[PDB]
Amino acid sequence: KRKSKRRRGRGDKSNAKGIRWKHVHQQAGRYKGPRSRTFEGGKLPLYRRIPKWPDAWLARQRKVLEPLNLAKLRTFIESGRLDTRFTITQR
Amino acid sequence: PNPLVHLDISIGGRDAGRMVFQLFADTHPITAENFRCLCTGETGLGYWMRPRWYKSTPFHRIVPGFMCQGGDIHRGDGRGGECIYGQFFRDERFLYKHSKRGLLSMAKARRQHTNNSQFFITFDACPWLDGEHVVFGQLQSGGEVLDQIEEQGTPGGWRKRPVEIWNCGELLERPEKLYEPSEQVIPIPDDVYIKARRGF
Amino acid sequence: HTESTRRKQQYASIIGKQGLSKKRCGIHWPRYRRRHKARRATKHKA
Amino acid sequence: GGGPGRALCTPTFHGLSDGPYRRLKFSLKPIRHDYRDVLVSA
Amino acid sequence: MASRGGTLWHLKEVVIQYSASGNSSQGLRFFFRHLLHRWKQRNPQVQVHTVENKYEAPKATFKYLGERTDSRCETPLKDLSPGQIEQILDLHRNSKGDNRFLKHGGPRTWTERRSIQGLWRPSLPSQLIALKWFRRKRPPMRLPKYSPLSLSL
Amino acid sequence: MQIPRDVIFEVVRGFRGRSRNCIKIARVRAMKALLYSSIMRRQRQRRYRVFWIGRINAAGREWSFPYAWLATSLWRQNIWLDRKMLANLAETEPASFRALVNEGKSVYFWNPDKVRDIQDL
Amino acid sequence: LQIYPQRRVIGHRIEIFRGKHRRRRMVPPRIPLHPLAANTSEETASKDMNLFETYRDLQLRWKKTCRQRKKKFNIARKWRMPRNIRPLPDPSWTLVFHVNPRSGYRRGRGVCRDRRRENLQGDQLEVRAAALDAAIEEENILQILRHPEKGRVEGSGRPRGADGWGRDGPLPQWMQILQRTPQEELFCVMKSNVSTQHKVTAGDLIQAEKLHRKQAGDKVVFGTVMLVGSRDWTIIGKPTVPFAKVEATVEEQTLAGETLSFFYRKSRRVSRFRRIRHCVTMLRIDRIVVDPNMTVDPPAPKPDRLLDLWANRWLYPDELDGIKRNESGEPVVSEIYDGREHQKGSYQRRGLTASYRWYPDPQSAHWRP
Amino acid sequence: RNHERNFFVRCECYFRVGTYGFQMAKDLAIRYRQRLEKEWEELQEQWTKLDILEAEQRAKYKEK
Amino acid sequence: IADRVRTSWTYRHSRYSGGVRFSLPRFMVTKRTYLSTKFRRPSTVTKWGNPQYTLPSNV
RNA sequence: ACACAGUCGGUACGAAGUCGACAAGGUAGUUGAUGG
RNA sequence: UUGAUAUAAUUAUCGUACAAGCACUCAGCUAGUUAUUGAGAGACACUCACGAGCCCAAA
RNA sequence: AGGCGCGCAA
RNA sequence: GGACUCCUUAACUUAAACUGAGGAGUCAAGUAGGUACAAACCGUACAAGGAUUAAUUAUGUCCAAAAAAAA
RNA sequence: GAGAAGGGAAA
RNA sequence: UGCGUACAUUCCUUAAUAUCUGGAACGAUAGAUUAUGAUUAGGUAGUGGAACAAAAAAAAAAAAAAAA
Structure with missing residues (x-):
């Protein structure tokens, strides 16, 4: 069985999400509060409380090599995906 | 051995006398314990x-040739009473008939249970009560007191003179059987339920 | 609403009868014709 | 609303059985002009 | 539907309209194949007619005896199973009608004889008993009351 | 809607004025009508019971045996006819009701062990 | 600052229970707990270690924010005070004669009104102190109306062996007059259900709760009779009349008319609407059988098939013809299982008993709450 | 569940330890189930026989 | 559909959800226009639905 | 309509006949229970 | 007719209020739309496919 | 072309 | 950043359906009964649904209004 | 016999 | 020394979807519905499950009993 649609404002007995709390106890306007992703009140956002971490965002910028596990290499060798009689290369 | 319990009966302010009853604790442990504790008053x-005591309690219903009912420790009129385990306790076993x-x-x-x-104490055999009321004991001495109690009854259940238990306590053949008991398979022993109630 | 209920009741009354005519069907004539074409569809090449 | 009386202690008349002559209205039939013809009142 | 000791049967006719092609009449056609003949054999007093209508919803019309205005009933049989159709048929076979006017409750006893000993009526003794209050009583004063002076004497 | 529109218009049949055909008013009137029915159908049992009780009391007082004594006597005698049956017997079977009253009296009016004759002393 | 617990009680001992107020489980536990602990071992075992209190429990007690929702546990309300009416007396019945010999009351077509004047005069007087066979019966009723006390009989509501329904010795031989009373002069009170009573004569139509697995035209017997009466006598059962039954025929197994149930509360968006049709059984009363020599109903029968007991319908005779039988005629499967009813009242519910009996009745056997 | 014969069976039988006894109730329940199985087999055989008879009747009717 | 809603872990799959059960009293009421009997009861039917006679038994 | 106008119930044929019908009647198809 | 019985509805509100706001009545119009884009994070979020693999843009 | 994931055991 | 009853309190004129705290009960979001009449008191084996059976809850027993005073 | 302090009126 | 009074999952008919009601059971060509199984089913805000909403489209509206 699929999911039934839950359109709002189609009677009091419908199991759609309610509208009364939204009308009465929620801030009016498009954004229901300040237009932001960081606002938590008058207090500072968590990220602004915490100090900056240059190492964290330089690690992401570091160019990295593709990891390969010797267990995976062994499995491929056993199944025959690579030939051990010749030098196994990146290609 | 089986407990022996005494009830001292007064008829209209006169000390009628003492009746002794043997309780069937071996076959009806729960009911016999309830009656013995109500006779002694130990449960408080x-x-x-x-x-939780039978002292100073009336016989609020007497029907000659049928029976006398008492033990209402709250009102003395038939709408009260309580066992030592709570308000009510389960019917134990219909082993014996009202045969004498x-x-x-x-x-x-x-309601059931x-x-x-x-x-109540039977004045004669009441075969129509079998399978509906639990017989848990029997009189051993006090037949004259029982006769005097019967003398105060009416067909409607009213008593000519008040009949009361002015004293009661403990002192420190059997009726016919409705069936023959036999050994049963009891996978869970008795103590396990109590330990579960306490949470093991 | 009332108009939709009335239209649905009339359509339920007429749509199940074969051989009706345009004057009998009124505003439901194209729907009735399409319904009969669909019902015939099964007879093609038997 | 409620009052000094009891709301549910007001008896209502009703029939404890049913029957076919509940609604049979009374109407006057024609009456004899000659009760002298009956022997008891001859 | 029985009365007069099971000699009058109120359900007289049943007319079943069905489609020979529609899938919503699959249960009805199954009923025709497997169960209809047995039902007719067990209920010989009911006339069962089957009418084919290709593009109409299946239904059953029940006609009873009498002119109480509750003797005509119609019930759609769309998408019902053979067992459900049989259940409806048994309901109507056991009814005297669609029972618009049958009420649950009430006195629950319809009779031609209210009373076998006669109804209660006021009588002279009863109407005299109704005036008991006006008779005089004899106050039971019990023992006499004595004065302190008399008791001291 | 709280009640279907067709049911509303069927229930408001016989009402006064616009309540018959205007949905806005018919809805309110039908809501009230069915709510009254719901409450009174739950309430009517005891209103019937008091009627039975009064009828039985009058019938017993006709024989000088009020309802209280009659009820105690029957219940003690193991007669468990209900109030509706007793009222029906009162209003339609007077001889049987009188027999019931006599049986009740036979149990209620018990006699003491010793009776005293003091008419000439 | 400390809140000191209240020790003495005003009323009854407190009792806590789970969930909101409602009708809930009431049967006392199979094995109870003795209030007194007889040993130190019992006293130590009494502790429930799942309730071991800790500072975390204290913090939950003292928290400033919202605590546990209050509707999860509540205080049990005060006990009730049921009347202990049992044991009830030995079931029995009484027959009393009230024959009225006045010509104004013995009119054939029946006076619309009872003779209350005769009732009262006779009460005061008593307080203050085939043709030839029919004539003999008339003589018997004449003797009884002269001396109504000679016709008073008290008997047992339960079988007494060779005595039948008599308290001491067999019933009087003259009690056969009760059989000759016409159905148009008989009425009785009978139960069509566990707690429904009807006053019925012959020819009545009674509505009862659905009798399971019955169809129009079936014959049924109601055995629970509490009062029988004619114009000459009345039998009152204490609580039932053993030697009376009511024959009836099912005329309908139907649904009553439509009923609307609507409830609502204003300004709370609370309302419920529902259409209902209720199952009913209409029964025509055929006759009221009264017979002092009536025999006790036979025990519940042993069906030849158990599947029907749990099927949607009874098996038709064509299907029943395929029952394997023993040489003695009994079905082969009877050896595997006799067919005795597993409980009380199942066969009566299915309609396989000699008659429908409910509970005022010494002869009934079923479950009660 | 037999739709062709309109026969639906659901047994919900209980053999209570308080009424009979643990072991005796177990034995009676086992016997009950065995009897139900036997009756079901016999009913299946009877239904096959009746079906063959019905086919014979229909063929005889079509003979006319 | 089944005799009742199944809540155990074995049946917590959308394949077991939905459906309608059949009950005759509910079927006889659903999808039927409601018709009151207020101004439609025959004079030959009592308000409890039983026989009612319009004339005295003597013609 | 006393009524937010509704809800639950809601009349019990005939003798309206008459060539009628145990113990007394003073013959009324009338009457029996009741001294301080 | 007579007996009993009942303080329209809706919204906000601690508050079941025609001294609170809207509405003569009725017809039609009239308000939770959509992730080729997001997701199941102790207040609830299903379901198929392949599987140490899985998907395949522009063209 | 590209994207995600790729045991921490043996 | 709720209302009222109860217990214990601070403020008030030992005032207020006043203000402010700590705990239980109802209302809020819980009908039908009692308490004379529109939440907060009493009582409920609290309202899925139907029905002309039954029960000692609060609380009553001269009438309105159901319910005792033989000889 | 009581805010019986809804009306009547009771020992 | 009594009685009145509110409460029935006593009877009959339905319902249970945030992984624990027997059911991990009995059936199985697609679940017929539990007969003394249990818990039970007042409800605002919030959350969740189910049944409708008579239409349109689709290349599946005749292998169907008896009658015609």
Whole structure:
């Protein structure tokens, strides 16, 4: 069985999400509060409380090599995906 | 051995005398314990904070040739009573029939499993009560007292003179059987339920 | 609403009868014709 | 609303059985002009 | 539908309209194949007619005896199973009608004889008993009351 | 809607004025009508019971046996006819009701062990 | 600052229970707990270690924010005070004669009114102190109306062996007059259900709760009779009349008319609407059988098939013809299982008993709450 | 569940330890189930026989 | 559909959800226009639905 | 309509006949229970 | 007719209020739309496919 | 072309 | 950043359906009964649904209004 | 016999 | 020494979807519905499950009993 649609404002007995709390106890306007992703009140956002971490965002910028596990290499060798009689290369 | 319990009966302010009853603790442990504890008063105060005791309790119903009912420790009129385990306790076993005069059994309300402090003593055989009331004991001495109690009854249940238990306690053949008991498979022993109730 | 209920009741009354005519069907004539074409569709090449 | 009385202690008349002559109205039939013809009142 | 000791049967006719092609009449056609003949054999007093209508919803019309205005009933049989159709048929076979006017409750006893000993009526003794209050009583004063002076004497 | 529109218009049949055909008013009137029915159908049992009780009391007082004594006597005698049956017997079977009253009296009016004759002393 | 617990009680001992107020489980536990602990071992075992209190429990007690929702546990309300009416007396019945010999009351077509004047005069007087066979019966009723006390009989509501329904010794031989009373002069009170009573004569139509697995035209017997009466006598059962039954025929197994149930509360968006049709059984009363020599109903029968007991319908005779039988005629499967009813009242519910009996009745056997 | 014969069976039988006894109730329940199985087999055989008879009747009717 | 809603872990799959059960009293009421009997009861039917006679038994 | 106008119930044929019908009647198809 | 019985509805509100706001009545119009884009994070979020693999843009 | 994931055991 | 009853309190004129705290009960979001009449008191084996059976809850027993005073 | 302090009126 | 009074999952008919009601059971060509199984089913805000909403489209509206 699929999911039934839950359109709002189609009677009091419908199991759609309610509208009364939204009308009465929620801030009016498009954004229901300040237009932001960081606002938590008058207090500072968590990220602004915490100090900056240059190492964290330089690690992401570091160019990295593709990891390969010797267990995976062994499995491929056993199944025959690579030939051990010749030098196994990146290609 | 089986407990022996005494009830001292006064008829209209006169000390009628003492009746002794043997309780069937071997076959009816729960009911016999309830009656013995109500006779001795050891369990103390109850739900309404009155003693769980038969002392100073009336026989509120007497039908000659049929039976006398008493044991209402709350009102003395038939709408009260309580057992030592709570308000009511489960019917234990219909092992014995009401086959003779002087048998003790438990009174009940309309609903099933309404055994409480209220009991009755048979004045004769009551075969129509078998399978509906629990017989748990029998008189051993006090037949004259029982006869005097019977003398105060009316067909409607009214008593000519008040009949009361002015003293009661403990002192420190059997009726016919409704069936023959036999050994049963009991996978879970008795103590396990109690330990579970306490949470093991 | 009332108009939709009335239209649905009339359509239920007429749509199940074969051989009706345009004057009998009124505003439901194209729907009735399409319904009969669909019902015939099964007879093609038997 | 409620009052000094009891709301549910006001008896209502009703029939404890049913029957076919509940609604049979009374109407006057024609009456004899000659009760002298009957022997008891001859 | 029985009365007069099971000699009058109120359900007289049943007319079943069905489609020979529609899938919503699959249960009805199954009933025709497997169960209809047995039902007719067990209920010989009911006339069962089957009418084919290709593009109409299946239904059953029940006609009873009498002119109480509750003797005509119609019930759609769309998408019902053979067992459900049989259940409806048994309901109507056991009814005297669609029972618009049958009420649950009430006195629950319809009779031609209210009373076998006669109704209660006021009588002279009863109407005299109704005036008991006006008779005089004899106050039971019990023992006499004595004065302190008399008791001291 | 709280009640279907067709049911509303069927229930408001026989009402006064616009309540018959205007949905806005018919809805309110039908809501009230069915709510009254719901409450009174639950309430009517005891209103019938008091009627039975009064009828039985009058019938017993006709024989000088009020309802209280009659009820105690029957219940003690193991006669468990209900109030509706007793009222029906009172209003339609007077001889049987009188027999019931006599049986009740036979149990209620018990006699003491010793009776005293003091008419000439 | 400390809140000191209240020790003495005002009323009854407190009792806590789970969930909101409602009708809930009431049967006392199979094995109870003795209030007194006889040993130190019992006293130590009494502790429930799942309730071991800790500072975390204290913090939950003292928290400033919202605590546990209050509707999860509540205080049990005060006990009730049921009347202990049992044991009830030995079931029995009484027959009393009230024959009225006045010509104004013995009119054939029946006076619309009872003779209350005769009732009262006779009460005061008593307080203050085939043709030839029919004539003999008339003589018997004449003797009884002269001396109504000679016709008073008290008997047992339960079988007494060779005595039948008599308290001491067999019933009087003259009690056969009760059989000759016409159905148009008989009425009785009978139960069509566990707690429904009807006053019925012959020819009545009674509505009862659905009798399971019955169809129009079936014959049924109601055995629970509490009062029987004619114009000459009345039998009152204490609580039932053993030697009376009511024959009836099912005329309908139907649904009553439509009923609307609507409830609502204003300004709370609370309302419920529902259409209902209720199952009923209409029964025509055929006759009221009264017979002092009536025999006790036979025990419940042993069906030849158990599947029907749990099927949607009874098996038709064509299907029943395929029952394997023993040489003695009994079905082969009877050896595997006799067919005795597993409980009380199952066969009566299915309609396989000699008659429908409910509970005022010494002869009934079924479950009660 | 037999739709062709309109026969639906659901047994919900209980053999109570309080009424009979643990072991005796177990034995009676086992016997009950065995009897139900036997009756079901016999009913299946009877239904096959009746079906063959019905086919014979229909063929005889079509003969006319 | 089944005799009742199944809540155990074995049946917590959308394949077991939905459906309608059949009950005759509910079927006889659903999808039927409601018709009151207020101004439609025959004079030959009592308000409890039983026979009612319009004339005295003597013609 | 006393009524937010509704809800639950809601009349019990005939003798309206008459060539009628145990113990007394003073013959009324009338009457029996009741001294301080 | 007579007996009993009942303080329209809706919204906000601690508050079941025609001294609170809207509405003569009725017809039609009239308000939770959509992730080729997001997701199941102790207040609830299903379901198929392949599987140490899985998907395949522009063209 | 590209994207995600790729045991921490043996 | 709720209302009222109860217990214990601070403020008030030992005032207020006043203000402010700590705990239980109802209302809020819980009908039908009692308490004379529109939440907060009493009582409920609290309202899925139907029905002309039954029960000692609060609380009553001269009438309005159901319910005792034989000889 | 009581805010019986809804009306009547009771020992 | 009594009685009145509110409460029935006593009877009959339905319902249970945030992984624990027997059911991990009995059936199985697609679940017929539990007969003394249990818990039970007042409800605002919030959350969740189910049944409708008579239409349109689709290349599946005749292998169907008896009658015609």
